[PDB]
Structure formats: C-alpha cells, structure tokens
Amino acid sequence: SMTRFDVLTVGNAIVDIISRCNDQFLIDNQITKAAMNLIDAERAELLYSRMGPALEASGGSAGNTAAGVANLGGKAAYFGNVAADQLGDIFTHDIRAQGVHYQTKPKGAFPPTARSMIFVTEDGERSMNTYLGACVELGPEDVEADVVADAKVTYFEGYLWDPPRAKEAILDCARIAHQHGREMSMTLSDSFCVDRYRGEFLDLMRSGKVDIVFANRQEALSLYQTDDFEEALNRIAADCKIAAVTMSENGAVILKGRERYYVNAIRIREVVDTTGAGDLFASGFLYGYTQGRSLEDCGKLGCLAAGIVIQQIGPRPMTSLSEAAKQAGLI
Amino acid sequence: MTRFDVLTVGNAIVDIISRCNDQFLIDNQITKAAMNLIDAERAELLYSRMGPALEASGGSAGNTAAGVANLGGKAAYFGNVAADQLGDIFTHDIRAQGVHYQTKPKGAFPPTARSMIFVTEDGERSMNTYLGACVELGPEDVEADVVADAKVTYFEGYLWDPPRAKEAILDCARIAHQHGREMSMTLSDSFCVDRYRGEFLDLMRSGKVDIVFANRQEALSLYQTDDFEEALNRIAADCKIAAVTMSENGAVILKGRERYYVNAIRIREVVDTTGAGDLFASGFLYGYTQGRSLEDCGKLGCLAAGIVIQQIGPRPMTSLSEAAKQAGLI
Ligand SMILES: Nc1ncnc2c1ncn2[C@@H]1O[C@H](CO)[C@@H](O)[C@H]1O
Ligand SMILES: Nc1ncnc2c1ncn2[C@@H]1O[C@H](CO)[C@@H](O)[C@H]1O
Ligand SMILES: Nc1ccn([C@@H]2O[C@H](CO)[C@@H](O)[C@H]2O)c(=O)n1
Numbered sequence: 081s082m083t084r085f086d087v088l089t090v091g092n093a094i095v096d097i098i099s100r101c102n103d104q105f106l107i108d109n110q111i112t113k114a115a116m117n118l119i120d121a122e123r124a125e126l127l128y129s130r131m132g133p134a135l136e137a138s139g140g141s142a143g144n145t146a147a148g149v150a151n152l153g154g155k156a157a158y159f160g161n162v163a164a165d166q167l168g169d170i171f172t173h174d175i176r177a178q179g180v181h182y183q184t185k186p187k188g189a190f191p192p193t194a195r196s197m198i199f200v201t202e203d204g205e206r207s208m209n210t211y212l213g214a215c216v217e218l219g220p221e222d223v224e225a226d227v228v229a230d231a232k233v234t235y236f237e238g239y240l241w242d243p244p245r246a247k248e249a250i251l252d253c254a255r256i257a258h259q260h261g262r263e264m265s266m267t268l269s270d271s272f273c274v275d276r277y278r279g280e281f282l283d284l285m286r287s288g289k290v291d292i293v294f295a296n297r298q299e300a301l302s303l304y305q306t307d308d309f310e311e312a313l314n315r316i317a318a319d320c321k322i323a324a325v326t327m328s329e330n331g332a333v334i335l336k337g338r339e340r341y342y343v344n345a346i347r348i349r350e351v352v353d354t355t356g357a358g359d360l361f362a363s364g365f366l367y368g369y370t371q372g373r374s375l376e377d378c379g380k381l382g383c384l385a386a387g388i389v390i391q392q393i394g395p396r397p398m399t400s401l402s403e404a405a406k407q408a409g410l411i
Numbered sequence: 412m413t414r415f416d417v418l419t420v421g422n423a424i425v426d427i428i429s430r431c432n433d434q435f436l437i438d439n440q441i442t443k444a445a446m447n448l449i450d451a452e453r454a455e456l457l458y459s460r461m462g463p464a465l466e467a468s469g470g471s472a473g474n475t476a477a478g479v480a481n482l483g484g485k486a487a488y489f490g491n492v493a494a495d496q497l498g499d500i501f502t503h504d505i506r507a508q509g510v511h512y513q514t515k516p517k518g519a520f521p522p523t524a525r526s527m528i529f530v531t532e533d534g535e536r537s538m539n540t541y542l543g544a545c546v547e548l549g550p551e552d553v554e555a556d557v558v559a560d561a562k563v564t565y566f567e568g569y570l571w572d573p574p575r576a577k578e579a580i581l582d583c584a585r586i587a588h589q590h591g592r593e594m595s596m597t598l599s600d601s602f603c604v605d606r607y608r609g610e611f612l613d614l615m616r617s618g619k620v621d622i623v624f625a626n627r628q629e630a631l632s633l634y635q636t637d638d639f640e641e642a643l644n645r646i647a648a649d650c651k652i653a654a655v656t657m658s659e660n661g662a663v664i665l666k667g668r669e670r671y672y673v674n675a676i677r678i679r680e681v682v683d684t685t686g687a688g689d690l691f692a693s694g695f696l697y698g699y700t701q702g703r704s705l706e707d708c709g710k711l712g713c714l715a716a717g718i719v720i721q722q723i724g725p726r727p728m729t730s731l732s733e734a735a736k737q738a739g740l741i
C-alpha cells in the first residue's frame with residue numbers, strides 16, 4: 081500500500097495581489113473579465129500603478145490545489161519555480177506551512193517571482209493579470225523523479241503551456257508516473273488557454289499521457305469549439321478516461337466511459353471572491369480519489385471545498401477542510 | 412487652504428497575518444494583545460512556525476493616514492521602507508489610497524519592517540515586529556513644507572523604539588507649532604508606555620503634543636494605576652485634548668473639564684481587531700480637521716474602528732466616507 085504522496089501538483093508558482101474593482105475598471109484597462117490575462121513587465125507596472133490598495137496571498141492554480149489536498153488531510157507535493165526574493169520567500173513559506181512537500185530550488189533573483197494582479201468585481205468574479213517572471217525557468221531539471229514515482233496522482237495546469245520549457249517537465253512526469261503505475265491529471269485552466277493549446281491538450285488526452293481531466297463549462301466548450309455543452313460532454317468522455325466538469329453554481333458532472341455522475345453545488349451565503357474555486361474543486365476530487373472514494377463522493381468533496389473557498393478572500397481556504405468534510409459526513 | 416489635513420509619522424511595516432489557537436501564544440512566549448519587538452533571528456524562527464499567511468500593508472500611523480484619506484481628508488505620511496518587494500508593496504498601498512508618501516528608501520538592508528500578527532479566536536491580535544528599515548528614519552526624512560502645511564501632525568509612541576525617529580518628531584513639533592498647527596500622538600501600546608513613560612509625559616507637559624490618543628490599558632500604564640478615573644483626570648491635566656478608547660465600551664473625549672462619552676457601533680462579529688485604535692484616530696482626526704464637535708469626532712472614530720475590526724487587514728477595504736454618510740455622520 082504505502083505510497084509517499086497522494087497528489088503531486090505542478091504549476092506556475094505565483095503570488096496573488098488582490099483588489100476589488102468596479103466593472104468600468106476592466107473595460108477602461110481592456111482586461112478580459114473572468115480570464116487569465118498574460119502581461120509583460122511594463123504592463124504589470126502600469127496595471128499596478130492603477131490598482132487600489134491590495135492584499136497579497138500565495139496563489140498558483142496547482143499550488144492552491146496542493147494546499148487544498150493537504151488541508152483535507154492528504155499527502156501533497158508541489159513543483160513550481162519562484163525567484164530568490166521576498167515574494168518567493170512568501171510563496172515557499174505558505175505552501176510548506178500547509179504541509180506540502182516543496183523543494184523546487186530558485187535559480188536566482190531574476191526574473192523575479194511571478195505575480196498576478198487579480199481584480200474582483202462586485203459579482204465576485206475574478207480577472208487575473210499575470211506576469212510569469214521566474215515561472216519561465218521551470219524545466220525538466222525541476223522534476224524530482226522519486227516524488228513522481230511515489231505519488232498516486234500527478235496533476236498539472238494547462239497554464240504550463242505558456243512558459244517555454246515546462247511542457248518538457250510534464251512529459252517527463254507522464255513517463256515516470258505511468259512507468260510506476262500512477263495516474264496523470266490535468267486541468268484545462270482557462271478557456272483562452274485552451275484556445276491557445278487546443279491541439280496539444282487533445283493530444284495529451286488521446287495519447288493517454290493524461291488519465292483524468294478537469295474542465296469548467298467554458299473550457300469544455302472551447303476545447304471542441306462548440307456552443308453545445310452536451311456535445312462537449314460526449315466528446316470529452318471519449319477523449320479521456322475520467323473527466324470532471326464543473327458548472328459553477330450548477331455543480332459538477334463526473335464522466336467515466338458511458339457513466340455520468342452529477343453533483344450539486346453547496347449553499348452559498350454570499351459569493352465573496354471566486355478565485356480558486358476550480359483549484360479547490362480539484363483538491364476535493366483528488367483527495368477523495370486517492371482515498372478510494374466513489375466518483376460521486378469525489379465530486380461532492382470537490383464541490384464542498386470549492387464552495388468554501390469562494391466565501392473568503394484568498395485562493396486557499398483559511399479554515400479546516402477536513403473539519404468541514406466531517407461535518408458534511410463526507411469524512 | 413492647507414495642503415494636508417493630517418500628516419502621520421510612524422514605523423512603515425507590512426503585516427503578515429495568521430489565525431492561531433491560544434496555545435500557540437503560550438508555546439512561543441508571545442505576549443497576547445501586545446506589540447512584541449523581535450530580532451531577525453526570532454523573526455525567522457516565528458515565521459518557520461507560522462501557518463499560511465496573508466500580507467497587507469500595516470504600520471499604525473500608516474493605517475491612520477490611509478483611513479483619513481478613505482474618509483475624504485487630505486493625508487500625508489512619513490515612514491521608511493527598504494528598496495525591496497515588501498517596500499514596494501507598502502509604497503503602492505499607501506499611495507494608491509491617495510496619501511502623499513515620498514520618504515526615500517536608503518538601501519535594501521535592513522529590509523522593510525514586517526510584523527507577524529497572530530489573531531486568536533476572540534479576534535485579539537498579537538504582533539511580532541522586526542523593525543528592519545524603520546531604524547533608519549531620522550530628521551533627514553522630515554519634509555518641512557509638508558509639516559508646515561498640515562493641520563495636524565500625528566505620530567506613534569512606537570517611534571521611541573528606533574534610535575533616531577524621536578529627533579524627526581521633535582523637528583516636526585517645532586515646525587508644526589511655528590506654523591500654528593497641532594501635534595498629536597498615540598501611546599500605541601501599554602508596554603511601549605512602560606518603556607517610555609517619562610518621555611511621553613514630557614512631550615505632553617512641555618506642549619510638544621496637543622492631542623493624545625490612548626486606550627484604557629495605555630492610560631492605566633501611563634500613570635501606573637489600576638484606577639481608570641484617576642487615569643482620566645490625570646491625562647486631562649497633561650494634554651489639551653485626550654481621546655481615550657475602551658474597546659467594546661466605546662470612547663471618552665476629554666478637554667479640560669469637558670467629557671464626551673461615545674458608544675461603540677453595532678457589529679456583525681469581531682473578525683480581527685488589528686487597526687481598531689489606528690482607525691479610531693482616523694475618524695477622530697478627520698472629524699477634527701473638518702471643524703466637527705469633539706463628540707462627532709468620537710462618533711467618526713468609533714464608526715471607522717467598528718468597520719475595521721469586521722475584516723482581515725488593518726485598513727478598511729470599503730468606503731468609510733459612504734459609511735459615514737449612511738450613519739448620518741457626514
Ligand atoms: N498563468 C497562470 N498559471 C497558473 N496559475 C495562475 C496563472 N495566473 C493566475 N493564476 C492563479 O490562478 C489562481 C486561481 O485559480 C490564482 O490563485 C492565481 O495565482
Ligand atoms: N513597532 C511598531 N510600530 C508601529 N506600528 C506597528 C508596530 N508593530 C506593529 N505595528 C502595526 O500596528 C498595526 C495595528 O495597530 C498593524 O497594522 C501593525 O503593522
Ligand atoms: N458561483 C459559483 C462558482 C463556483 N462554485 C463552485 O465552484 C466549482 C468550480 O467553479 C463549482 O463546481 C461549484 O462547486 C459555486 O458554488 N458557485
């Protein structure tokens with residue numbers, strides 16, 4: 081039985097810089113609402129100069145997912161590259177403090193640690209503006225082969241296709257994982273990210289490099305360039321062994337071959353900030369999965385964690401997910 | 412026309428915030444509810460034991476300046492950060508709020524001050540502060556035209572810990588009074604008062620300070636008494652105006668023989684008390700520089716403080732001016 085890690089995640093190591101804004105701010109600054117907008121250093125300086133007083137919190141989609149698995153009680157690890165600077169030190173502290181194995185060594189102080197200016201509108205939607213900085217350095221040299229070998233599931237971001245060499249690391253992970261009888265998982269990350277890497281993502285799924293795919297409605301529609309969600313569901317199920325597809329307030333559906341398991345979203349008092357919802361859905365699902373739970377229960381765990389994170393500021397729940405899971409009888 | 416309503420001067424700090432259980436404070440010998448000074452080695456040790464955290468610009472006076480700006484007053488700030496990422500954060504947040512902030516970093520070492528703030532289930536906050544670049548603040552950082560052009564210059568008792576900051580404050584007092592302005596201070600923390608009791612009383616009695624902010628604990632510590640009534644009578648004798656806060660019991664404003672009692676506002680829950688006194692000073696000084704009555708100054712203070720304790724972060728993220736309009740205070 082004894083495997084060192086339940087879930088290894090791999091992603092862009094990012095610190096979030098968070099501010100609430102009005103709707104007009106997104107229009108004036110040509111920020112695509114609800115999306116991840118890549119920006120260069122000049123634009124990062126420009127947007128920051130226009131941003132209100134902010135809060136900082138460790139982010140990165142996969143980073144959040146790893147933290148969420150640890151909070152739930154699972155054994156997690158993380159690969160992601162920061163710089164040797166104060167933001168890097170924050171990132172390192174926060175993920176390690178949650179009890180995630182994190183050992184990726186910074187390569188120097190420049191480029192500096194990635195940051196994402198995240199603007200949260202009154203509806204709770206989040207629009208991210210990301211300077212990748214030190215994330216561009218993540219490569220095959222950062223694969224801790226023993227960790228991939230000893231993790232039940234290695235999960236990675238579609239976002240990793242933006243930096244130049246991260247994809248090589250992921251192909252190395254896929255090889256090591258499958259050689260050791262483990263599983264690979266990916267998230268489609270963002271609908272524009274899917275627009276950029278559609279062919280490569282489909283090839284990952286169809287070649288069997290990815291066993292479990294996470295998508296939201298928008299990403300699924302984008303993957304097949306369709307407006308027909310039923311078509312998207314049918315096609316994604318044909319392309320990967322297990323698909324977990326989130327539908328915001330309408331919950332989730334888990335697909336396996338011809339099987340579909342629908343799960344309801346939880347009751348929200350108020351949607352504060354949706355940042356991290358998809359990441360924490362993956363935390364809940366992968367925690368359940370690596371505990372041998374039913375696909376329906378994995379979905380329920382995902383929706384529980386996602387529901388909690390959207391009721392706070394910050395992409396990583398500050399409360400105990402394991403305690404919430406116990407109260408909810410998901411255990 | 413005066414350029415600024417309120418200039419504040421303080422230790423420029425970024426907060427690092429985590430919730431902890433009661434035992435964590437005992438285990439780490441952290442004095443609860445207090446500002447605990449720490450060296451670089453202890454800062455690393457405590458950080459190593461701290462859970463996942465959130466960062467937000469802090470500094471008592473920095474928070475007060477931000478609150479005045481939020482309410483709609485014209486604010487400025489003197490405080491020293493380093494040329495590093497935390498310094499960049501601090502500089503951004505205070506300037507983005509519309510506060511004049513022009514103090515120049517002197518280098519990257521010491522690095523920007525940070526305070527690890529541990530919030531217990533009761534909402535109390537226990538701060539652990541490595542002063543870093545704050546030790547460099549001195550007379551060279553006094554923008555004399557700013558002091559000359561500010562209705563009130565307000566400063567922290569906390570400034571007596573770093574070595575040269577008191578010299579800057581004495582320069583401020585001279586320029587302020589020469590230009591007919593008023594000087595204000597907060598006693599900051601009861602242990603800070605324990606450390607600098609004599610000096611603080613001398614500031615008040617010499618007339619270098621006109622308006623004093625204290626909480627109950629600081630007022631008792633100032634006179635080393637258990638008698639709150641004695642503390643009120645004595646503080647009124649030592650300074651022209653005293654604003655004394657009593658947590659959930661509101662505040663009392665003293666001027667000579669006059670006393671104005673003000674109630675705390677109704678709140679949904681105490682999330683994190685960090686910044687309550689700072690934002691009381693924000694509301695009070697905003698009111699004061701708008702020509703409002705001392706009681707209305709108190710009410711504005713209790714409104715701003717009541718708002719800040721219902722959120723994580725020592726600086727209100729919501730509009731204080733809108734809240735003041737809604738509360739019918741403006
Ligand atoms: N390009 C990116 N790659 C990975 N994660 C990102 C990117 N941009 C923003 N994020 C993260 O997405 C999280 C929300 O899913 C935020 O915590 C933020 O840090
Ligand atoms: N030594 C200090 N000097 C000034 N401000 C401080 C000190 N220690 C903590 N603080 C600030 O006190 C604020 C709460 O009053 C916090 O935001 C924190 O940054
Ligand atoms: N407005 C929203 C948005 C999201 N969610 C929860 O987060 C998951 C992924 O979006 C969704 O599957 C759902 O669990 C929600 O409950 N309400």
Ligand SMILES: Nc1ccn([C@@H]2O[C@H](CO)[C@@H](O)[C@H]2O)c(=O)n1
Pocket residue numbers: 626656657658659661662674675676681684687688691712713714716717720
């Ligand atoms: N538990 C608490 C603590 C503080 N406060 C408000 O903050 C001011 C300074 O403590 C106090 O004067 C008060 O207005 C509060 O309302 N409740």
Ligand SMILES: [K+]
Pocket residue numbers: 353354355356389390391392393394395396
């Ligand atoms: K959130």
Ligand SMILES: [K+]
Pocket residue numbers: 683684685686719720721722723724725726
């Ligand atoms: K607070």
